[PDB]
Design a protein around this nucleic acid. Structure first.
Ligand SMILES: [Mg+2]
Ligand SMILES: [Mg+2]
Ligand SMILES: [Mg+2]
Ligand SMILES: [Mg+2]
Ligand SMILES: [Mg+2]
Ligand SMILES: [Mg+2]
Ligand SMILES: [Mg+2]
Ligand SMILES: [Mg+2]
Ligand SMILES: [Mg+2]
Ligand SMILES: [Mg+2]
Ligand SMILES: [Mg+2]
Ligand SMILES: [Mg+2]
Ligand SMILES: [Mg+2]
Ligand SMILES: [Mg+2]
Ligand SMILES: [Mg+2]
Ligand SMILES: [Mg+2]
Ligand SMILES: [Mg+2]
Ligand SMILES: [Mg+2]
Ligand SMILES: [Mg+2]
Ligand SMILES: [Mg+2]
Ligand SMILES: [Mg+2]
Ligand SMILES: [Mg+2]
Ligand SMILES: [Mg+2]
Ligand SMILES: [Mg+2]
Ligand SMILES: [Mg+2]
Ligand SMILES: [Mg+2]
Ligand SMILES: [Mg+2]
Ligand SMILES: [Mg+2]
Ligand SMILES: [Mg+2]
Ligand SMILES: [Mg+2]
Ligand SMILES: [Mg+2]
Ligand SMILES: [Mg+2]
Ligand SMILES: [Mg+2]
Ligand SMILES: [Mg+2]
Ligand SMILES: [Mg+2]
Ligand SMILES: [Mg+2]
Ligand SMILES: [Mg+2]
Ligand SMILES: [Mg+2]
Ligand SMILES: [Mg+2]
Ligand SMILES: [Mg+2]
Ligand SMILES: [Mg+2]
Ligand SMILES: [Mg+2]
Ligand SMILES: [Mg+2]
Ligand SMILES: [Mg+2]
Ligand SMILES: [Mg+2]
Ligand SMILES: [Mg+2]
Ligand SMILES: [Mg+2]
Ligand SMILES: [Mg+2]
Ligand SMILES: [Mg+2]
Ligand SMILES: [Mg+2]
Ligand SMILES: [Mg+2]
Ligand SMILES: [Mg+2]
Ligand SMILES: [Mg+2]
Ligand SMILES: [Mg+2]
Ligand SMILES: [Mg+2]
Ligand SMILES: [Mg+2]
Ligand SMILES: [Mg+2]
Ligand SMILES: [Mg+2]
Ligand SMILES: [Mg+2]
Ligand SMILES: [Mg+2]
Ligand SMILES: [Mg+2]
Ligand SMILES: [Mg+2]
Ligand SMILES: [Mg+2]
Ligand SMILES: [Mg+2]
Ligand SMILES: [Mg+2]
Ligand SMILES: [Mg+2]
Ligand SMILES: [Mg+2]
Ligand SMILES: [Mg+2]
Ligand SMILES: [Mg+2]
Ligand SMILES: [Mg+2]
Ligand SMILES: [Mg+2]
Ligand SMILES: [Mg+2]
Ligand SMILES: [Mg+2]
Ligand SMILES: [Mg+2]
Ligand SMILES: [Mg+2]
Ligand SMILES: [Mg+2]
Ligand SMILES: [Mg+2]
Ligand SMILES: [Mg+2]
Ligand SMILES: [Mg+2]
Ligand SMILES: [Mg+2]
Ligand SMILES: [Mg+2]
Ligand SMILES: [Mg+2]
Ligand SMILES: [Mg+2]
Ligand SMILES: [Mg+2]
Ligand SMILES: [Mg+2]
Ligand SMILES: [Mg+2]
Ligand SMILES: [Mg+2]
Ligand SMILES: [Mg+2]
Ligand SMILES: [Mg+2]
Ligand SMILES: [Mg+2]
Ligand SMILES: [Mg+2]
Ligand SMILES: [Mg+2]
Ligand SMILES: [Mg+2]
Ligand SMILES: [Mg+2]
Ligand SMILES: [Mg+2]
Ligand SMILES: [Mg+2]
Ligand SMILES: [Mg+2]
Ligand SMILES: [Mg+2]
Ligand SMILES: [Mg+2]
Ligand SMILES: [Mg+2]
Ligand SMILES: [Mg+2]
Ligand SMILES: [Mg+2]
Ligand SMILES: [Mg+2]
Ligand SMILES: [Mg+2]
Ligand SMILES: [Mg+2]
Ligand SMILES: [Mg+2]
Ligand SMILES: [Mg+2]
Ligand SMILES: [Mg+2]
Ligand SMILES: [Mg+2]
Lengths: 126, 206, 50, 146
RNA sequence: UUGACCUCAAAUCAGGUAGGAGUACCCGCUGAACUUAAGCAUAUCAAUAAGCGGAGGAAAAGAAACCAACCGGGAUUGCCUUAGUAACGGCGAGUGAAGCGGCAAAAGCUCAAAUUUGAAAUCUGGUACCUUCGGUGCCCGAGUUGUAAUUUGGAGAGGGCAACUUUGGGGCCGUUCCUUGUCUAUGUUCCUUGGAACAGGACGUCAUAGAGGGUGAGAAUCCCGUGUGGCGAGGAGUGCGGUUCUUUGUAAAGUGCCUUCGAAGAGUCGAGUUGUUUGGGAAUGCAGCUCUAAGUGGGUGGUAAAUUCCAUCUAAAGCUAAAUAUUGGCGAGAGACCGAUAGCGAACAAGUACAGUGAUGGAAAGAUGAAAAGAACUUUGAAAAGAGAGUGAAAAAGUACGUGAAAUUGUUGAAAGGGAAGGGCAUUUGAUCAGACA
RNA sequence: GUCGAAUUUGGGUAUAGGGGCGAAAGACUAAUCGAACCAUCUAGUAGCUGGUUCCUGCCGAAGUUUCCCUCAGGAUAGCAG
RNA sequence: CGUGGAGGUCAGUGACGAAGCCUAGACCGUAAGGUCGGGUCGAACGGCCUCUAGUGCAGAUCUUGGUGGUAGUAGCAAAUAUUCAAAUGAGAACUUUGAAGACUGAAGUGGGGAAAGGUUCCACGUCAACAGCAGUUGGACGUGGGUUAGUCGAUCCUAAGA
RNA sequence: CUAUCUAGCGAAACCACAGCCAAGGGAACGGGCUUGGCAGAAUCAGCGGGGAAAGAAGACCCUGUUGAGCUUGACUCUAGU
RNA sequence: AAACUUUCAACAACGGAUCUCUUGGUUCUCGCAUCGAUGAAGAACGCAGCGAAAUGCGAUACGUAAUGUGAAUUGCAGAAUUCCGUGAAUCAUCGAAUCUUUGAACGCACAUUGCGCCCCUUGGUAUUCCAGGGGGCAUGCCUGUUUGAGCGUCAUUU
């Protein structure tokens, strides 16, 4: 259990801190786990999802589908995959909204910084 | 304490074909005209509003306190009570259950769970952790959310890492002999907790 | 009125500006809650008290 | 409003007493804060022991005089018979009291002997720099019981 | 004529300070009545509410003109007690403290009155430079109607005699304290149900981590955290640990004996009287007016007075951390609390909408679904809509949207009804149904 | 009724609650007047009026004594558990 | 007996349907109540030993909210008054235009202002609500446009007074 | 001009449950209770017998150890003088 | 016999109880000491590509600078050069700025966007009139500076 005096087990406080979290904080909550491949590749279990990454839906009814993240919708706590959409009745397609904890990262998108993140978590990077 | 009293309402007195509770003054809102202050009034003050100087704790004479926990210890033998209490003890060798003092030096959960298993704890540990349900009440949202049974209570003479080893395994409490809380010896005021004593602790008892 | 102080006309102007309905694009925003304009005012219904 | 056979109570709640109720909900809180206080101080205070040397003194009136009890400070006389001045004894952790007088030799000697034993049983580090780390004893009252 | 001095002016003169806010807690002033007394004025409520002035992070109090009466104690504050006691009181209703004792925290001091008189030794300001919370040089200025050193009653000061002992001020780096950033385990394997697995079963792993929240349903092991640790960053600061540069000094301080002294607060203390207040009682404090001291004096010693003693302090000037308070403010952790008529009035564009000339008064109002997938298209219609269709796990979820009670309403079905209806015991008839045979 | 004046009347201005203003009715002082309105003291007090929320089991009264500024109320004895 | 919550326990019930709600269907209890079926529903909840209380309603001219009978009822009757046609429109007693009949009778139902409102002005669009019948009309609703100063007011002056 | 009938629009008071009598007894004037008279759907315009109809916790009267405006050689004070 | 009234049921109304929710409230505890003439608290009016409000801001106006993060914002449009980068962002942090008309509110007023004075500067042929730009002028009190007043009063002239 919590041993620190600055942690709060309070449920009402957690749920406030989630929904009222600023854009910067949602970035890290919106982490997705690396694929078993990419994990032993990079020596790292999970990373905050970013836009042009590549991803496989491992949960839900889009289970098995893959694509490129078209946008991180931080406001909505949802990530959108280009290639995963609803065809509507009038035929106009519309994005589905996915949660990064139900995705898996199959290809990263690397930066000077995106690399340094992997290095700051203590893992190899091919 | 200022609740329900935050208005200037007065009774309209008799003669209006309307009851006598004070009523909010003025107009244009419809708050105005409504019963105020009353214990039966919407928005009124409650009857006998709760106060903080109510008695919360309770004094128990130190000696009878001891008599109680003595009694509670003496019942952690007597396998019928431990059995009647929950506590799957049929598969354990003997009661009191005394264990090597080496147990107090175990530094690691898995090791300590393994130790407990070897001595018979297993089915009790499994009784917890098969038992965790959602608290039925509104306590569920009061930071009381989950629930479960009580596991075995490991008693040591000196904490060499046993206290931190078992601290994460559901249901298990650890206690120095020197303390011995009555709340854990008879949880829910029910005698016969399953107690796993180390030998060092078992002798300090005398 | 019909000869007014500038403070009176100034307030009078700000109330003209507040007299529209809910701009309908707000209605579409994420978590949008506001339905209509509930502060809307009419000249023969509620008076401005200056 | 008087009936049966009952003691006559005198319960003074005719003022607005609910205004002035004090429930000590902070008992446990302030005990911790007092323990932390002492801890933080013992650290700031170097090996020095949190408390000052206190004299033997005979407790006043007819009821308590049979018992002897710790006083405030040491009476410029008693300080002088132990061979140090007031100003220096204050820097040494001895409490000095200019107001107390000696009418009684037996107590006078007890406090001079108390001062003697204290001087022997302490070490006073040099002004210089060195501070030869000495491990604080926290009491004086416990080391020098009365 | 010229130059001071005293006192009083003026500058958009050079530099500063005050106001207002808040006010939970704190220091003062002012000040009720409802109420209680079974009526009522003294009393009580209450030295309370409202009104006024003033502070702080605490305020105030504080190094005894104290308590005591003992073998005496020894600043203040607070808690436990003293004690519902001593005492006050139409001695009625009611009121009501203190000393001792235990504990928390502890801490002590500085002026006035002294000839530096072989040297105003002191200080604001301006100005130039400097190592700028400051230093130094110089000039105006203050100030002898007294600015420094020295001394504060515990003392202490001037002489004379005799010995030892003891230092100051900078830099700089840590730690301390403050603000922060980052990183740090373990399944998303199989089967079943489901729209969704976060459910049940199987088989595992981590656990100094099985607090918590998130994710399409009860998720330690999907995510963020949690636990244990690691690595940084920016500060403040003299608390102290190290270091290191200057020796402050022909400086400062402590101690023993001899001797001479020993300055110590006035329209005050105190007294009378009046009013108020207090448990304070021939008067507890406070204030007005009149009277007004002394220096082996003065104050107190809880029954007025005269005499004689005794004990105990040293007023009429001053500073001071902690233990203490806190329905305010900033930041946190919580609960056998309330759960949308509850809980703050306000879970919402709530002190809003609205009322009132104004002071002020002041509501109602949360919930489609995992996802808008918020109904394409056809048909009837002037339209709104209807009927199809479509979406959805479900429209028995359609922005009138979770569940959707009751009063009350429509339809359909059944039955009864000569100025109410409803009810009790009993049985006919109709409808409906349990159990039990074997 | 009166209608050229002790006339009618706008605006500005003064007077404020035991106070104002009154050719005097206790009139008028913002639908409020034998003491306006607002908030607070205040949940004022009420021997008086109204209400007081589940079941069953056993026992089961009093309206009388005495005192009371007592007579719609208390205390006291009695009856009751 | 029954409610909210708390300790213990039955490794209790449940998305293969918890709770709730409905039901002249069933069963247990003298009763407070308990139990089951069916329907509806959608995420939680119960038994037992103990703890706890903001714990049980028919009344209080009770509080707030909702709803009836009354009842398609009282009524929509002051200010003399309307009528024919055409246009428009899904739709015309009520809008537009033409015609007729009237009225206010300059002490105006006329032409402008002060106070007060504050956009009601004007145009275009336009009928869900509103104008106690209607509505194509409007002081409504939507979207826009419009208020030009050396000489007109303010501003300056003084009045009671502040 | 209403009422009245129609189209549109459409409230309120009030309401234990209700609504035919005579007698009786009864809280001494019953819609209900006892005994009789009687009694047939559903209704429209009127009406003022009854509903001890409605409208306000009776203004009168008494009680209350409840007030307030006013007066006075009531008690007790007080600005002023 | 209907209609009508009434009772029960089903389905549909009305209405929003109930159950289950909870970014709110309440109460306790712990830590801390920071408003304002260096213009506070409060007020008014403004500010977005498309806003009435709420929240934020001040003509540099849902923001400018700086620092950390490291790719968003998102209702629509949008820019596109912002994606191995002095760089996205309704982000976090915040140390630099801007900060209308006001307010203790300070040139005087204020039911007025009313009315003065001084200084520097620019334009109009301008020390003097008009216009634009910038900077100023409240009150009490303290220390000091400077110009003073009084037979209050000392001296010094010839
Ligand atoms: Mg990370
Ligand atoms: Mg009524
Ligand atoms: Mg309330
Ligand atoms: Mg429940
Ligand atoms: Mg009007
Ligand atoms: Mg308004
Ligand atoms: Mg208003
Ligand atoms: Mg008390
Ligand atoms: Mg407190
Ligand atoms: Mg101490
Ligand atoms: Mg040192
Ligand atoms: Mg100046
Ligand atoms: Mg102030
Ligand atoms: Mg009271
Ligand atoms: Mg009384
Ligand atoms: Mg009384
Ligand atoms: Mg009275
Ligand atoms: Mg008093
Ligand atoms: Mg008093
Ligand atoms: Mg006050
Ligand atoms: Mg004040
Ligand atoms: Mg402050
Ligand atoms: Mg403190
Ligand atoms: Mg002293
Ligand atoms: Mg003391
Ligand atoms: Mg008494
Ligand atoms: Mg008193
Ligand atoms: Mg969940
Ligand atoms: Mg979870
Ligand atoms: Mg951590
Ligand atoms: Mg003195
Ligand atoms: Mg007074
Ligand atoms: Mg007195
Ligand atoms: Mg005497
Ligand atoms: Mg003494
Ligand atoms: Mg001083
Ligand atoms: Mg002081
Ligand atoms: Mg608090
Ligand atoms: Mg509410
Ligand atoms: Mg409740
Ligand atoms: Mg409310
Ligand atoms: Mg819902
Ligand atoms: Mg709802
Ligand atoms: Mg349809
Ligand atoms: Mg269909
Ligand atoms: Mg459903
Ligand atoms: Mg539904
Ligand atoms: Mg729809
Ligand atoms: Mg529904
Ligand atoms: Mg029946
Ligand atoms: Mg059968
Ligand atoms: Mg059968
Ligand atoms: Mg009055
Ligand atoms: Mg009065
Ligand atoms: Mg007066
Ligand atoms: Mg009125
Ligand atoms: Mg009036
Ligand atoms: Mg009451
Ligand atoms: Mg009352
Ligand atoms: Mg009575
Ligand atoms: Mg009997
Ligand atoms: Mg008497
Ligand atoms: Mg009676
Ligand atoms: Mg029970
Ligand atoms: Mg339930
Ligand atoms: Mg039924
Ligand atoms: Mg059955
Ligand atoms: Mg169900
Ligand atoms: Mg749900
Ligand atoms: Mg119980
Ligand atoms: Mg209750
Ligand atoms: Mg009810
Ligand atoms: Mg009722
Ligand atoms: Mg009842
Ligand atoms: Mg009711
Ligand atoms: Mg109709
Ligand atoms: Mg009609
Ligand atoms: Mg009529
Ligand atoms: Mg007519
Ligand atoms: Mg017509
Ligand atoms: Mg005519
Ligand atoms: Mg005429
Ligand atoms: Mg219409
Ligand atoms: Mg209208
Ligand atoms: Mg109409
Ligand atoms: Mg219409
Ligand atoms: Mg318009
Ligand atoms: Mg003119
Ligand atoms: Mg002008
Ligand atoms: Mg006809
Ligand atoms: Mg009709
Ligand atoms: Mg008869
Ligand atoms: Mg009759
Ligand atoms: Mg009747
Ligand atoms: Mg009649
Ligand atoms: Mg009637
Ligand atoms: Mg009455
Ligand atoms: Mg009276
Ligand atoms: Mg009166
Ligand atoms: Mg008389
Ligand atoms: Mg007289
Ligand atoms: Mg939910
Ligand atoms: Mg809370
Ligand atoms: Mg915005
Ligand atoms: Mg930002
Ligand atoms: Mg001014
Ligand atoms: Mg101006
Ligand atoms: Mg200017
Ligand atoms: Mg001066």
């Amino acid at each position: 259990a919590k041993q620190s005096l600055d942690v709060s087990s309070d449920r009402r406080k957690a749920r406030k801190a989630y929904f009222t979290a600023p854009s910067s904080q949602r970035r890290v909550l919106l982490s997705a786990p690396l694929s078993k491949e990419l994990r032993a590749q990079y020596g790292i279990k999970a990373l905050p999802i970013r836009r042009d990454d590549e991803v496989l839906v491992v949960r839900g009814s889009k289970k098995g589908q893959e694509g490129k993240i078209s946008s991180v919708y931080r406001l909505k706590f949802a990530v959108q995959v280009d290639k995963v959409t609803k065809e509507k009745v009038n035929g106009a397609s519309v994005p589905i909204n996915l949660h990064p904890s139900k995705l898996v990262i199959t290809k990263l998108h690397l930066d000077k910084d995106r690399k340094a993140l992997i290095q700051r978590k203590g893992g190899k990077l091919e | 304490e200022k609740a329900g009293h935050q208005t200037s309402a007065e009774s309209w007195g008799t003669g209006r074909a309307v009851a006598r509770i004070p009523r909010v003054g003025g107009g244009g809102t419809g708050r105005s005209g409504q019963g105020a202050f009353g214990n039966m009034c919407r928005g009124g003050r409650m009857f006998a509003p709760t106060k903080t100087w109510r008695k919360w704790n309770v004094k128990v004479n130190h000696n009878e306190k001891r008599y109680a926990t003595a009694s509670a210890i003496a019942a952690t033998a007597v396998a019928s009570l431990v059995l009647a209490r929950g506590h799957r003890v049929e598969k354990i060798p003997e009661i009191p259950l005394v264990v090597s003092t080496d147990l107090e030096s175990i530094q690691k959960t898995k090791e300590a769970v393994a130790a407990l298993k070897a001595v018979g704890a297993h089915s009790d540990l499994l009784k917890v952790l098969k038992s965790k349900k959602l608290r039925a009440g509104k306590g569920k949202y009061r930071n009381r959310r989950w629930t479960q049974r009580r596991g075995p209570l490991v008693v040591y003479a000196e904490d060499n890492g046993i206290v931190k080893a078992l601290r994460n395994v559901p249901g298990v409490e650890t206690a120095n002999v020197a303390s011995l809380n009555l709340l854990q010896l008879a949880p829910g005021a029910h005698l016969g907790r399953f107690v796993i004593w180390t030998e060092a602790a078992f002798t300090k008892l005398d | 009125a019909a000869q007014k102080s500038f403070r009176i006309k100034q307030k009078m102007a700000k109330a003209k500006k507040q007299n529209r309905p809910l701009p309908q694009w707000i209605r579409l925003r994420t978590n949008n809650t506001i339905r209509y304009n509930a502060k809307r005012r009419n000249w023969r219904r509620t008076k401005m008290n200056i | 409003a008087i009936s049966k056979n009952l003691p006559i109570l005198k319960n003074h709640f005719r003022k607005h007493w609910q205004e002035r109720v004090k429930v000590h909900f902070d008992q446990a809180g302030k005990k911790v804060s007092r323990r932390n206080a002492r801890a933080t101080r013992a650290a700031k205070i170097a090996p020095r022991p949190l408390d000052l040397l206190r004299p033997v003194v005979r407790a006043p009136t007819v009821k308590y005089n049979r018992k002897v009890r710790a006083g405030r400070g040491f009476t410029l006389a008693e300080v002088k018979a132990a061979g140090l001045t007031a100003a220096y004894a204050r820097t040494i952790g001895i409490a000095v009291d200019h107001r107390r007088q000696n009418r009684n030799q037996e107590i006078f000697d007890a406090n001079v002997q108390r001062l003697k034993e204290y001087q022997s049983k302490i070490i006073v580090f040099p002004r210089n720099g060195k501070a030869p780390e000495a491990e604080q004893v926290l009491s004086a009252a416990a080391t020098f019981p009365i």
